[PDB]
Every structure is written in C-alpha cells, then in structure tokens.
Symmetry: T
Subunit: 160 residues, 12 copies
Amino acid sequence: DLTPKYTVPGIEREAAGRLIGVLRLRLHALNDLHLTLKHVHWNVVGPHFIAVHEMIDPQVDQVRDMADDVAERIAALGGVAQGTPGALVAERKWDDYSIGRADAIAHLGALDVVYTGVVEGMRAAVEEAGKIDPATEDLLIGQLRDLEQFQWFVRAHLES
Amino acid sequence: DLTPKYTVPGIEREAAGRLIGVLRLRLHALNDLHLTLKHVHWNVVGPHFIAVHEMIDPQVDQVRDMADDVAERIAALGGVAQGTPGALVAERKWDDYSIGRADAIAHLGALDVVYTGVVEGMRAAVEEAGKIDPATEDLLIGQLRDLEQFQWFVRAHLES
Amino acid sequence: DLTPKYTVPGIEREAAGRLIGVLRLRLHALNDLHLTLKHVHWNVVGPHFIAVHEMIDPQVDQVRDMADDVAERIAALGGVAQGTPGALVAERKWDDYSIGRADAIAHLGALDVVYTGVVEGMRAAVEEAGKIDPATEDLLIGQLRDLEQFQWFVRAHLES
Amino acid sequence: DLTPKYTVPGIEREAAGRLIGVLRLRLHALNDLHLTLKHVHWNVVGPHFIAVHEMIDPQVDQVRDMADDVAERIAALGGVAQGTPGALVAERKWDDYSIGRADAIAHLGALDVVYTGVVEGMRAAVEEAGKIDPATEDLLIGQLRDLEQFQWFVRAHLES
Amino acid sequence: DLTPKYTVPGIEREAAGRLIGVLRLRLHALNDLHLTLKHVHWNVVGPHFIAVHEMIDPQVDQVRDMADDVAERIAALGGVAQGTPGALVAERKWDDYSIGRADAIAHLGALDVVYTGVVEGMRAAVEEAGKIDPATEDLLIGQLRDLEQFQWFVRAHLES
Amino acid sequence: DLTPKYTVPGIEREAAGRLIGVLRLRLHALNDLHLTLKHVHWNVVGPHFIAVHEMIDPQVDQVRDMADDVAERIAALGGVAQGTPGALVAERKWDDYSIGRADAIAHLGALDVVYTGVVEGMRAAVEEAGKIDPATEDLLIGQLRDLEQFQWFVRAHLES
Amino acid sequence: DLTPKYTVPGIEREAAGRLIGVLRLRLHALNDLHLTLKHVHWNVVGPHFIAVHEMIDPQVDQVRDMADDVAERIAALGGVAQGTPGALVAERKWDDYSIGRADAIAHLGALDVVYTGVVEGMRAAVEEAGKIDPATEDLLIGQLRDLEQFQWFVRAHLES
Amino acid sequence: DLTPKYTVPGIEREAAGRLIGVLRLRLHALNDLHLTLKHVHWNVVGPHFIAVHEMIDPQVDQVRDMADDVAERIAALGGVAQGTPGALVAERKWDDYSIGRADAIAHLGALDVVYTGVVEGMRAAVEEAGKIDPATEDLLIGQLRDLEQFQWFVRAHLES
Amino acid sequence: DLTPKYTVPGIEREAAGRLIGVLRLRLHALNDLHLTLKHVHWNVVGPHFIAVHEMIDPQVDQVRDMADDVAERIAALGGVAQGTPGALVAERKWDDYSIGRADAIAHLGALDVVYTGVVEGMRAAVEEAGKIDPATEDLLIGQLRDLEQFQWFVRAHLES
Amino acid sequence: DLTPKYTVPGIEREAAGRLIGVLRLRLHALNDLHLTLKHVHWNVVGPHFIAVHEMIDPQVDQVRDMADDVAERIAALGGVAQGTPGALVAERKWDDYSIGRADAIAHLGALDVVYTGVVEGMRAAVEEAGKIDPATEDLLIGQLRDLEQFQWFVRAHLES
Amino acid sequence: DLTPKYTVPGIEREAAGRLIGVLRLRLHALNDLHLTLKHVHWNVVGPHFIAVHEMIDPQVDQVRDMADDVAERIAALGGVAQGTPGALVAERKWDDYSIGRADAIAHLGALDVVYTGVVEGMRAAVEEAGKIDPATEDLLIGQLRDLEQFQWFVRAHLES
Amino acid sequence: DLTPKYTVPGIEREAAGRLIGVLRLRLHALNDLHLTLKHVHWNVVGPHFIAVHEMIDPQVDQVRDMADDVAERIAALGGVAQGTPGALVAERKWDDYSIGRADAIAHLGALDVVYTGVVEGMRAAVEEAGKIDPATEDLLIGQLRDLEQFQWFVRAHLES
C-alpha cells in the first residue's frame, strides 16, 4: 500500500512501507505543531507575552528542523513526505488548535495538551520503528526527548 | 465584523477591520506557500533536484519571514493572525498543491501556477491597503516584488 | 527661512526648506524617544522588568538608527540636523516623560502615549513629504511601520 | 519592440516592454557609475586620498548590488539585462568620466556632476515606473534615496 | 534628599544619597555628550569630514555605553537615573553646544572645550566617589581615562 | 602557614600567605555562588521562570570566569586554589542554599541574601588586599562592582 | 519517595521517581567532576601543564553542559535537580579529589581513577534508564561515550 | 589477537578485542569512502558536475569526521586505528572504485553501489557492537543514518 | 610615452612605462571579463541556470579583486589605471560578448572563447613582466592560474 | 600516453601529458601524506601526544587542501586526478608508514623521513613544471615551502 | 625637561612631564618585551616547543596592545612615545636577551628573569603615577596584574 | 660561519648558511620597519592624523606577519632568527627613524625614504635567494610586492 519500489539497503520493502506510514503521520504532527507554535507566538498578549515569545522562538526553529529530518527519512525509505495542509487536515487524528488572541495561561495550557498528543504519538512511533530499523528509531528518540523538554518549559510556567 | 476594539493610531476601526480581512487571507496564502515549497523540496527527484533545493531553500526562509511580518501587522491592527491548518483549508480560495514525488519540471511547472495565484492576490491586496494605510501598503509592495522575483527563478528553469 | 543654498537634484529649494522643517521636528521626536526608552530601561522595576528590558533594547538601537537616517537626509537636503537637548526642549511640542522609578505597567502605559504622539507626527510628516519628494516619503513610511509595531509590543503587554 | 513574450503576472506585455526600456538605461547608468567609482578609487592621489577611498568603497559595493537588482527585475519582466561595455557606450546619453590621476577635489567635483545625472535619471525612471508597476517603482525609489545620500557625502567634502 | 530607602550592602544610605547626586550629574554630562557627538557627526562638512566621522563613531558608541553603566550604578544604589532632556536642560551646569553646519576645525575646537568640562567633572566625581565607595570610584576612573583619550584624538587634529 | 615558597616579585612571602588565605575563601564563595545560581536556574518554576533564566544565564557564566581569575591569582602568589566541594563545605562560613523547586519570588528572595553575604565578603577582601597588593585589590574591586550589579537585578524583581 | 506529582507523558509516576533518583546521583557526579577538572586546571604545574590545560578546557565546558542536560531532564520528570555542594557532599559515594599543587602525572593519574568511577556509574544508570524510558537512556548513552573518550585522552598521556 | 592490554571501564578485554576488529574494518570503509568521494569530485564532468560538487562537498567533510570518531573510539578501546593505504588495500573486502573522468550518471551510479556496501557493513557492525557496548553501538547508528541519507541524495539524482 | 615621472624603487622609468602599457591592457581585459560574467549571470535561462549562477558568482567576485590588484600595481608604477568603459571599448582588441538571453550551453560555449583570449593575453603579459619586474610577474602568474581554473569549470560543463 | 585530447590554452598537448604524469605522482604523495598524518594523530600516545595533535591538525587540513588544488590542476590540463587507494598503492615509490601505537618521538622521527621524501619529490616536480608551465610551477613552489615548514615543526621537536 | 606645552585637563604640566618620563621607560620595557617574546617563539626547540608557542602567542598580542595603550597615554599627556630601537637600546636599563636557539627550559628560565625586571619596573611606575594621576595609575595596575599572570605561566613550567 | 648543522632537504649546508645571512638582515629590516610604523602611528598629529592611522594600521599588522614568516624560514634552514633590539641596532645598515611628534607630511616623507631602503634590500635579497632556493625566493617576492604597494599608499599622500 505504502510499500515502496525500492528502499534503504538492508530493510525489506513491506516493512519500509509500514515505517513510511508511521513517519507520515509523525510528519503531519510536527508540521501542525510548528504552525500551532507560530499561531501562539502571533496571538499571545498580556504581561507574559515576551516570555512566551522567548520560549517559543527556539521551539519553532527546532520543530521545523525535526520535520525536515523526518521528511528526508521518508524520502530515503521510498515514500512521499506529504507536506500540504489539505492532506494534513484530511489525515490528522486531532483537532485544530482553538485559542485566538489570549493571555499566556490560556495559550500555554492549550499548548501543553497539544504536546501531550505529540509526545505520546512519538513514543508509539519509537516503539514501531525500533522493530523495523534502529537508524529511524534513533532519529525519533532524540526528537522525542527534545519535544518532552519543550513541553516541560510550557508546564513549568503553569506550575503553582 | 473583523472590526477591532482598538487599532493603530490614525486609522479608523472600520477601515482597520477591512484591512485585517485582506491581510488574513494574504497570511493564509503565505503559510500555504511555505508549506508547499517544503513539500516540493522534500519530494523533488531526478537530475535537477540539487538545483531545486538550492533555489527553494532561501525562498522557504524568506516566505516564513513574510508570514511573520504580515501576522504581526494583523496583531498591531487589532486582529487575529490565524495560523492553524484547519482554518487555512476552510478559508482558502485555491486547492492543495497536487504533485507528489516527481522531477523538477513537474514541480516547477506546478509551483509557477502557485506563484501566479500568490502574486495576483498580493497585487490586489496592495491596491486595497494603499487606500487604507500606506505603512501596510509599503510592507506588501516589498513582499510582492520578492515573490515575483522568486517566481522568475522558477520560470527561468522552464524556459526553452 | 529654512530654505537651503542648494539641495538634492530635482527638488526646488523652497520646497526643500519646508521638507527640512518637517524632518527637523521628526528628528527631535526620534531623539526624545530614544532618550525616553533608555530612561524607561534604567528605571523599570518589579517582576516584569526583564521583559521590559528585552522589549526596549532592540527598540533603542533601532530608534537611534532612524534618527541617524533622518539627520543625514536633512543634511543632504541642505539643512542643519539639530541634535542638542536645549534646542530639542525649546522646539518640541510635547512634555518630558514623567515616570521615575516604577513598575512595567506604569512605564508601558506612559510609553504607549509617547508612541501615539510619535506615530501621529510621523503619519503627518509622511503626507507632507509625499507632496515634495517620494525618496524622503519612502524613508518615513518604513520608519512609521516599525514605530507602530514597537507600539504594538508595548500595548500587547497592557492587554487584558 | 522591447515587448516581451511573457512578463510578471498582472502587468500587460506592452507596458512591460516600456518599463524594460526604462530599466535598461538605468542599468547602463548604474554599471557606468560603479566603473567610474572604481576608476576614481584607483586614480585619486594627494592628502585626501584615504578619505576618498573610505567614502567610495562602500558606494562601489552598494552600486554593484543596485545593478544586480535592476538586472534581475529586467529578466523577471521578460527583457535582456544588457551588461557589456560596447552596448553601454553605444546606448548611453552621457560622456566618459574624464579625470585621470588627480587630487580629491578634482575627482569629487567631477563625480558630483556624474551623480546629478544618475539621480535625475533615476527620478525620471521612478515617475515612469510608478505608472506601470508599484513593485518596480518601490525598487527604484529606495535606490534613488541611497544614490542621493552618496552624492551628499561627495558634496559635503567640497563644501566651504 | 536623594537618600535611598535601601542601597548596596556595606554603604550607608546617607552617603549613597550623596553618591547618587554626584552620578546623576555625571549621567547628564554623558547623555549631553553623546547627543553632542551625534550632532557634530551629522553637521560636519568640508575636506576633513570623513576623518571626523571615523573619529566620532566609536566615541558615540562608547559614550552611550558609559551612560548605561553609570545609570545602572545609580539604580543599584537606590536612585533614579534621570535620562529625559527636560531634566537634563534644567539641571546641567553648561550651555548647549552652539556650532551648526561647519568644517572640522570649528567643530573639533568646540568639542575640545566640551570634553574639558566633561573630564574635569569626571575627575571631581572620582575624588568624591573614592571617599564613599571604591567600586563606583573604579567605574568612573576607567571612563575618565577613555574620555581623556577621546579628547586627545580631538586635540591631535587641531595641533600645529 | 599559607606562606608560599616563592611569590610574585615585589610582595613579601608572609604578606602573600595572608593574601592567599583571603582569596581562598573568596574562591569558595564564588564557586558556591555559581553552583547556587545553576541550582536556581534548574529549579525555578511558575510564570516568571523565563525571566529568571534570562537573568541568571549571564551571571553564571560571569561568576565562573571570576572564579578562574581569583584561582589563577592564588596560583601566581604561590598558593593552592582549592576547588573541590568537600573542602568548600568544610571551610565555608555560610549554609547551603535551601530552596528546592519554587517560584521566582522564593528563589530571588533567597538569592538576594546569598549575594549580600558575597558582596560583604568581597568588600572586606578588597580592604585587606589593598594593604598588601594593588594588582589583587584592583581584580577584586571590578568583580565586587559586577556582583553588586547582579544583586541589583535580583532586587529590582522583588521591588514593590 | 522521589515519586513526582506528575511526570512526562507515557511514564508512570513511581517509575519516574526511581529514574529521578538515578539521575540525581549522576548529576552529583557530573557537578563534582567539573569542580574537580577546574581544580586540576588551576593547580597543575611543571613542564606538561599547558598540555593539561589544553586537554581539560573543552572537558570542563562539555561536562558543565552534560550537568545542565541531566538537571533539565530531572526537572521535566518532576524532580529537584539538587546542585548545592552541601547536598552533593552529603549524598555522594566517593571521596574528595585529593591532589593539590602537583605535576601532570600526579593529577592525570588521579583524574583517571575519578573518570573510572564516573563512567562505571553512568554505565549502571544507562542500564536502569533503559528499563524505564528510552529518551533518558539515549541522553545518558551519548554522555557516557563522551566521558569515556575524555578518559582516553587522560590515559593516553600516562601510556608508556 | 586484537585483545587489548586494557580497555574502557566496564568492557571485558576479549570482547573489546572483537569490537576493535569490527571498528577497524569500518574505519577502512570510511577512509576508502572519503578518498572515493574526493576522486568523484575531481573527475566528474558534463552538465551536472556543479550539482555533484554541491552534493559531495558536505559528504566528504562529514565522512572524514566519522572516520576520526571511529578511530578515536578504537584508540580508547585499546586498539590501533590503522589509517595507511597499504593496510587498507590489504584488508578491505571490496575493489577500488573504477570510474575515471566521466559524467554524473556514471559516477553517481557507481557511488550508489559503493554506499550499499558501506551501509550494509555499518548495519552489521551496529548489530555486533550492540552486543558488546551500547556507547559504540550508538556512535555507529548515528553514522549509519547519515550515510543512508547521503546515499538517498545520490539515488534521487538517478531516479526516473 | 607611458613613461612615468617616478616609479617603484629599483625599476627604470622607461621599462616601467612599458610594464604600465602591458598592465593597462590586462586591466581592460579583466574589467570586460567581470562585466561579461555579470551579463551571463543575468541572462542565462533554462534547466542549468542555477548551476551557471553557482559557478559564476565566485568568479565575478574574484575577477573584480584581480582588477583592483592590477590597477593598484599600475598606480604604484606611476601610471593611470583607466577604468571607464569608453576607453575600454576604444582600446580593447576583442569584440563585445554577443549572447543575450540564452541557455547554459550557449553562454558557457561563448564564455570559454572569452577566457581563451584572457588567459592567452595574461600568459603573454607574464612573459613581458618577467623581464622587467619579478613582483609584477608573480602577481600575474597567480591570477593566470586562477583564470585557467575558472575556464576549466566552464569547459567541464561542456564536456561529452 | 597521458597526452590529453585538449589542455589549458597556450600549453602543447604532449608537454601537458608529461606535466599530468608529474602532478599525478605528487597527488599520490599528498594523499598518502594526509592519510599518514591522520594515522599519526590517531595513534600517538604518551606525555607529548597533545603537542602532536596540536601540530598535526592544521597540517592535515592544509595537506588535504594542497591535494584538491593539484587534482583540479590535473583536471584543467586534461588528465585524471586518480584518488583511489588501490591505484595509490600500485603507483607509489615509497612504503607504507610503519609505526602503530607509539610515543611522539617514534612517530615524529618516522614522519620526518616521510616529509623528506615528499619535499624532495615536490622540489623535482617544481623543476619539471618550471619548464612546461609557470602557473603550475608557481602552485607547486608555494606548497613546497609550506611542506618544508611543516617538516621544520616536526624536526624542532626532535632537536637536542 | 619632558615638561609638555599642554597636557590632559586637571594635571599640572610639570607633574605631567615627570609622568611622561616614567611612561617612556615603561614603553621601552614593553617594546623590548614583545620583541623578546617573538625571539623566544622563533628560536625555541625541543619536545616542549609547541607548549612554549601556545603560551607565548597570546602574551605577544597582549603585550603589543599594552604598548599601544601606554604610547597613546604619553601622547595625550603631551609627550613623545619613542618607539624606535636605537632610542630603546640607548635608554634602557637592562641588557639584550641572550638565549639563541635553545630548549624550553633555557628560554623560560631566562624569560622569567626578564619578567621580574618588567613587573618590578611596572610596580614602581604604579607608585609614581598614583601620586600624579589616578587614570594613568589605573592603566598601569591592570597591565601589571596581566604581566604577573604571564610570568606565573612561565614559572609554572619550571616548577619541580 | 652561519653554516647550519642541517638544513631543509635538497639545499647544501654552505648555500643555506649564505641564505640565512641574507634573511637575517631582511628580518632586522622588517622588525625595525614595524617598530617605526608604530612610532609614526603614535606620534603623528595635525589634520591628517586619522588618515595616517587608517593607512598604517593594516601595514603594521602585515609587516609583523612578514617578520614571522621570514623568522620561521630562518629557523627551518637551521639558523637563529635574531629578534632582539641590541642585535638589530648592532647589525643594521641604516639609522634610527628621526621624526618625533610631527604632522603627516613630515612623517610620510621620512617613511617613504624608510620604505625605499626596505624595498631595495628586499629586491637584492630576492636575487640572492633565487640562486639558492626558489621556495625562499617566492616568499620574498610576495612580501616585496606588498611592501612596494604600502610605499605607494605613503607616496600617493605626498603627490601634488
């Protein structure tokens, strides 16, 4: 189904097709996450907005880099790294981020929930990739730890 | 309707609400454009793919910067700079980019059509902004010229 | 009166003298604005002072650069770019910024009022310059948009 | 005549052909100007030559960049950005710069006259472009202001 | 009178209030000095103006940094670092710099007199601070030596 | 007792031994201070934690540099710059910083008390060094002023 | 006991509490290691001291970075990253580094023994973390390899 | 046989000797790979040679860095990191790259076959190292993924 | 005829005049070459245009630097480094580059012929300079080798 | 035999073929030299190994750059720049470097002998190239002097 | 005698003349010191020469900077900063450094004696300047501490 | 006499001893030249002193680099690179630079005479080295051309 014509040496094509499907959905989640982080950066107001900007800037740049790395891994395995928004909205398993112009507590509380979905999805993908290819598993594990640390910074703000 | 509670000094609120609606749709177009440029970068293959990468890299970074500048202008005028993909897909007036894994001619021919839509949309927005606020018109005119030049690089490849 | 002995090619001397008077007062406003921004940076205290520092630092550097560009434009047109404080206090049409040691809300609320005066003054100068010389009008329009965006960051803090 | 086969979206081909002719002559003037500035840098002597070097260095680099931007605009509009010296000498409407080895006053006095021709030519091109395409007009207006400021530095030396 | 509510550990409040008054007037002098240096940079003409620009550029940047350091020292001691021009003009003990558009000799001769006032004021402040707090005395002594060296560069030009 | 076998030229060995003892305890205080600043950075939570991070980062780097400079001065004088934690805990004259996971007010209030101890200790060391060696006194005076300024930033947050 | 109130998504609280205890002791070991490396840098003498400086400089900077990463991981898991020296001395399972002023062979021989303890401790922590959370295991494995390589550089000096 | 006299703490000497043999052959493969990549860079001609240069440059630099990291790991484990060409030619299990001066398709087709051998060899080494030492396995897994991605760029060119 | 009034120490004036004539024509050739390279960069189209841009960019910058070095050598020898286009067109011994908007093969084939003329001219100048002054011969020999290497990159594209 | 189909302008094909043979063997020697320098860097141990690392690092980078320059010169002349190890071992006129894990004196003594062979080979190549083409002779002479200076640093260590 | 015509404000001319004489001899000592440090760098051989290079490089650059600062202070005070070697040899109160080609112990032992003379001379100059001008005293005290620290690095090598 | 015990491969010891004597005197001339350039920088006054500073700064840095390169060449050949001022004054064949505090014309006129001596000395050394070793001749020829160009900048100021 997503089975490629050829793939990376040492991986069977059928197994690569299943890894491609796992990475395709992680790529959707990372693309939706950096769109959401920018949305938060643009629409946060109130006395903590500078702190949200300072926190989110480096996360947006790092999440965009994660997406590039997962996409190029898809391509290497023989798949299509689908990056268009129509496809993302058609295939995702979560709803649009719903906060508009709002203070930091409102945005950060909602972004914490966004990150729970992302990190749980990545933790499931790590388990599936670990059975098919340790190079892709290793890629996902480093990104999972960075995403959990970005979530911790969001949570630390909400603590007390 | 999009009329803000307050806006930039010297601009009437009702006129700001109309400028907000114009910039909201330009922001959708710029967000869809950098998602599309990344999609092309990830999925171009064949003997010209390195040239497409070299052309598209700086365009992705510059288009992401244009989106930030239009979004912060929306925010300053009193509007919501909507950056989520569900809203973009619900409000846009064009279809998803449709090329998957493909050679440079296929991608560049389709990206040329994408850019015609963007530059015509920006040229219309320049005319509307010029009647409401010269600072926003000046922002859009500099971005229009850069987008047309990015389109020229795409077209030059297809020439002959 | 401010009519120069010679001016930039293509501009009449009498019209240049009127543009010189418009830019002389904008230069006073920009000089008073960066003195005021430094005053705020030095005297803000309380739990948001780091956020005020982070916001104001880049504004001070950019406003100092705007002043240099308006001054060199005055010089090119044949006028004196008057930068001394005695003259600024004698010719300005606004009062000294009045907040001493104080928290962010007090400073930012007063700085918002300062910026309304600056941006309204710049918007009036844009209209006058547009009738005399499009190169000077274009200079002022780019600075107006940056000043309005700096005002938005001040306002966003006070929102809610 | 200079009418292109196709041009930037939203501009009629016949109007683009006239804008191409206007930009072609501005490109000749900018190319002759940076050749002339280098000639001055290489052949100025006497007790002010270090000051002429310091003034002219950044102008040469900026004028070379202006030429690239006008040339790429010509190309985008569908025209030939003609950069060879035989064509420049055949089409220009001014004479060769005539000062050889000479002191700063001699060179700067002649370069001031060169710049009057350039800035008047650019001011005329701005008016023509403003009727055909605001993106090209905006390009030329920013270059005009920088050229007038470079002329002011040349004039300031000769003042007294 | 300027006695603070609290001050740096190890310094008595009454003595801190007197040190605050000494630093407040030095801050006025440094603020007026960088406004004056910019005024000179903007309004110097004639065959030595490039040399004045090259000399004054680094002095303006360094004097602005000195002002920040004295202001933050005032703040640490418990005082208001007053940076507005109305207050500077009301409290200063010298007149406005009086040279408009003029050649280097005119400006440099007047700036030399400005610096004599600044360096004598700083030398008096060093003596007063040395009796109250060696950390503030050490700050002022490093700035005094840099200011005297900037004065030497101004004087060297006028020598012969 | 701490009397070295040889020391810097121009200083008597017995006096160097007393200066070594003074610097050894200042080195303990600086080492405990950067360990404490890192502890605060790692364990601050709540809506001001980003501001505490931004404040403490540069202080940690600068305090680590102060420790290196005092240690190398000890070494030059002929002493052992003791940097291990067992020795620091055995020789220090203050208790462990006691705040765990906590908001900015809790940490900053405790860090202010830490800095009072450090700056009073440094002010006493300056007086002792000034009697033995002006080069070591000058080192300590520059560090004292920076530490007091770092304390002011901590205090400014707690003001109101 | 160290069981947190909440932890990273996908990890049980009780298991997180055990991982927190493992990382708390690794953080003590890394903090004691960079204090020890600085102690060696400050107190090495003799004809190989420049080589010890060149070797230890980058290790100190990298070990300080490892400590930050383990501490922020503790914080994300819900624990206290304890960084104070009293606690480190109370909880560690090794003695203070015991070499004072000494040549490279003496220091490097003792530092080799220090590193054996650190790398064995890290190898045990990797095994425990691998059973609880692959993201924390992956963090520790990259640090283990760098620490073993730093130990090799220390050993290579002592070889022959 | 390759059993070292001593090795990294926590690894048995006999097992280290087997890991040394595995890494010795991977080092030969990486050394032959960067020699081969340079050979391709120097001898590619035809209309795609600039694209091959742009692709291969960063690969040569990264492969040279991989070789350094594997060699230093060998050294740490107690082995000889053999880097001379006589030994590489005597011990390798593949033939010399055979393409001389040739177009991109010829070189890239042959380099794809080279990379299949390298990545299969690295995937086998990962499995062997994973049984002996997770730090060396982790090193090899990150290099495997980068090598497979470099192979994908070579393959993408040949696609269609 | 081109005999200078004075020249570099150790060179006879008459011989310097002949070296000046040789360098004057090489300066014309280098000036026409960088004008031609820019012309090619601006007017190349088709599927290889990005590769031509990447090749020509560094050549334009390096050829402009060669021209500066030959011009300053002319000046040092006592001659006029003539840089204006009227003089270049009057004195050159080759025709204007004749390709307008065209694909890479057309431009590169013509640029190869341009470079043959330049490198043969430089090789003749090296022989003449070698008889008059080894410092000028050494300057020309380094530029000849770089020009031949730039020609090789142009030729490599056309190979097959 | 190595006679190329075409070569650099101004050089006869038969003479180019002989220069190609001379440069082909120098390229082998430079390739074997940087492989050997890396081998030494990886396998030096004992109390001077940091000094050998510091000496050899810059030599490896510079020797790799020399190889690129000789290879591109071969290519320009019409030859194959052979970079594979099988060919190097088949064509070289010296034996493999024979020192494994060893102290600095052992490695440096052997590397000195390696460099004698390289510099004598380069000095012979300079004489042959000087008869065929001064641009290639000039390339080799600059590399010879750098290689002799690298040999001096190796020898200086062994002196006494 | 060295009494200047005018001097820095606030210093009597006769006292300035005595300070000029003190700084003139310190400038000789700093000039002779950086000539001597270069001499050592160029002529050290044996197994520690790389360590001497690494130590002396930064000292040469810093000592050259000290000389510039003392010279510009002399100039500001109204004196001649004498930098020629004939004058240095005629006025100095020490002999030429006497070690030629030699190992590190020989050079470092002699350089230690050189530094004792420099630091004792600087300590005497600090005492004399402290009575005339605190700005010059402060300059000399910072340089004294850096020179003593450079001496410590030389001594540390000789320790044991 | 200056015959070394051993020298660079391929050069006879007796010939090396004569080349060492030639380079020893060139090193004296370069050392005296950068001491003289600093002397001029420190003691130039009057309305052109900023221009002299701007000209001389880069020359001092480049002449110091030339001295290092000649000294390391002496060392490689087996000689002593003598850098002390007593030896320079004893062996030089020219007098001390004689201008004290003076305007640019006085200094530049004298520095022009200094450079004539240096460049004539270097031109003689080039001829002698060319007979013994082309690598040393090539070093001296590049330095000669840079020195002549530095002399041209000094002369250009004095022209008219």
